[PDB]
Design a protein around this ligand. Structure first.
Ligand code: HEM
Ligand code: NCT
Length: 465
């Protein structure tokens, strides 16, 4: 029965609203940690949350006490559509079934294997083609990168990749993009505290709902399409494998394989498989143009190990320590999902002499692990040396946790690291990156930080080398 972690006294309903700047949630919670310690209690409106800061607090909970911290908490904006259904927002039995099935089915369509390495190499080549065809003109790379990324997971879950022509495609991409931005604003973070009121009020949360509805309707139309052209012995994509598994479980009335879980799971993958990698690429190029010395070492190393002729491949990894360090440092620096997705204690839990009642939400401050001064000698700088030893060979970090850790850690990690290596490598093989402004003027502080870290709007050009 010990005590909850210390933290500032909340008000009825508003919680710790007075100590929170919803524009800068992460900076807010970190200011509070400086006063209360690395483990503290915050009230996000009426949501009682335990916040974990620094590598040690986060590894201790999510790894050393893995089972106890394995429950899924809420993200309220996403909840509006998912409603506890689908792999990401589910718990207990639902969670174990959808994750085990999702991981396996991803692996059946080539994730972690030559299959998807081919699909990514191919789709990369299509990206090179498009950036050439701009002929060095000053463009917004946003939808160039995200079309390419989205087409990879799209081929896995929908079968065939989207034609760049498709107007529905861009529409979906705008939708995904506007949701990531919304959830990263003051208002999206205010919604995390006050959703039981705000869901019924007018404002930018109404528009973010319409985008979620947009994505749900598109997935439900693709499912429909898949069902009535289905072939039970030869699955065409993820949706088919879940349709089939649905059919096998018409006997079991306690099954988790029904329509709503298929829709929401496919939506999770589509969304998860698109926006984070895409935001990482986009920040990544921005960082590279700001650090032209880094771009030159990368260029130097691409030329010696790969040269201009062949397609980069995943194994090149092993022989490119400086590129792996660059991509590691883009992820670390980007901090794209700075507060993870919320966890929940699965039962009454003891954790460092605090007591956590069953159901308490947990915030793993992944951003604080990526910036932990005990693991990286210059947290606020972009410096690939963070992941290099004395001998310029790749150096692992225990604080490299952009995908989180523990039992509900990101299972798209393997796909992502593959897409990131290949897309970054192939793009810089063919282009030098040319900024709109001089390196000293490039602003890499974020536009929005909340659920995600969003880079500022920018333009650039892609010049042949
Ligand atoms: C830059 C790439 C990515 C980053 C930084 C990232 C980040 C994260 C984080 C921080 C979590 C929460 C894990 C936890 O609760 O401990 C998560 C979960 C998840 N991710 Fe990713 N992710 C990425 C890519 C992907 C991709 C490509 C997919 C699609 C295949 C994907 C699908 C998912 C799913 C389905 C979950 C829910 C895990 C569960 O509840 O069991 N992610 N991700
Ligand atoms: C933000 N994401 C990256 C991995 C999980 C994914 C996500 C988050 C919220 C809803 N669906 C998918």
């Amino acid at each position: 029965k010990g005590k909850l972690p210390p933290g500032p006294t909340p008000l009825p309903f508003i919680g710790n609203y007075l100590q929170l700047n919803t524009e800068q949630m992460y900076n807010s919670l970190m200011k509070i940690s400086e006063r209360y310690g690395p483990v503290f209690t915050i009230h996000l409106g009426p949501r009682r949350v335990v916040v974990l800061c620094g590598h040690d607090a986060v590894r201790e909970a999510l790894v050393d006490q893995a089972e106890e911290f394995s429950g899924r908490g809420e993200q309220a904006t996403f909840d509006w559509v998912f409603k506890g259904y689908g792999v990401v927002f589910s718990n207990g039995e639902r969670a174990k079934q959808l994750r085990r099935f999702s991981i396996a089915t991803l692996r059946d369509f080539g994730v972690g294997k030559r299959g998807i390495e081919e699909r990514i190499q191919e789709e990369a080549g299509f990206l090179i083609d498009a950036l050439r065809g701009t002929g060095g003109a000053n463009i917004d790379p946003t939808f160039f990168l995200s079309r390419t990324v989205s087409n990879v997971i799209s081929s896995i879950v929908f079968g065939d990749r989207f034609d760049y022509k498709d107007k529905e495609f861009l529409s979906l991409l705008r939708m995904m993009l506007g949701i990531f931005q919304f959830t990263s604003t003051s208002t999206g973070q205010l919604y995390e505290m006050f959703s039981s009121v705000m869901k019924h009020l007018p404002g930018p949360q109404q528009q973010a709902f319409q985008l979620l509805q947009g994505l749900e309707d598109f997935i439900a139309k693709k499912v429909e399409h898949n069902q009535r052209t289905l072939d039970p012995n030869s699955p065409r994509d993820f949706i088919d494998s879940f349709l089939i598994r649905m059919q096998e479980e018409e006997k079991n009335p306690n099954t988790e394989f029904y329509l709503k879980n298929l829709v929401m799971t496919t939506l999770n993958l589509f969304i998860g498989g698109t926006e984070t990698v895409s935001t990482t690429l986009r920040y990544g190029f921005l960082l590279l143009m700001k650090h032209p010395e880094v771009e030159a070492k990368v260029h130097e190393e691409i030329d010696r190990v790969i040269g201009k002729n062949r397609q980069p491949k995943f194994e090149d990894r092993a022989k490119m320590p400086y590129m792996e360090a660059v991509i590691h440092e883009i992820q670390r620096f980007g901090d794209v999902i700075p507060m993870s997705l919320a966890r929940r204690v699965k039962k009454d839990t003891k954790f460092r002499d605090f007591f956590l009642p069953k159901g308490t939400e947990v915030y793993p401050m992944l951003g604080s692990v990526l910036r932990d001064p005990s693991f990286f000698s210059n947290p606020q700088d972009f410096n690939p040396q963070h992941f290099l030893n004395e001998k310029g060979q790749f150096k692992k970090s225990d604080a490299f946790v952009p995908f989180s850790i523990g039992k509900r850690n990101c299972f798209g990690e393997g796909l992502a690291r593959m897409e990131l290596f290949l897309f970054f490598t192939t793009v810089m093989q063919n282009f030098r990156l040319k900024s709109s402004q001089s390196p000293k003027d490039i602003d890499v502080s974020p536009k929005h930080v909340g659920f995600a870290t969003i880079p500022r709007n920018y333009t650039m050009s892609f010049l042949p080398r």
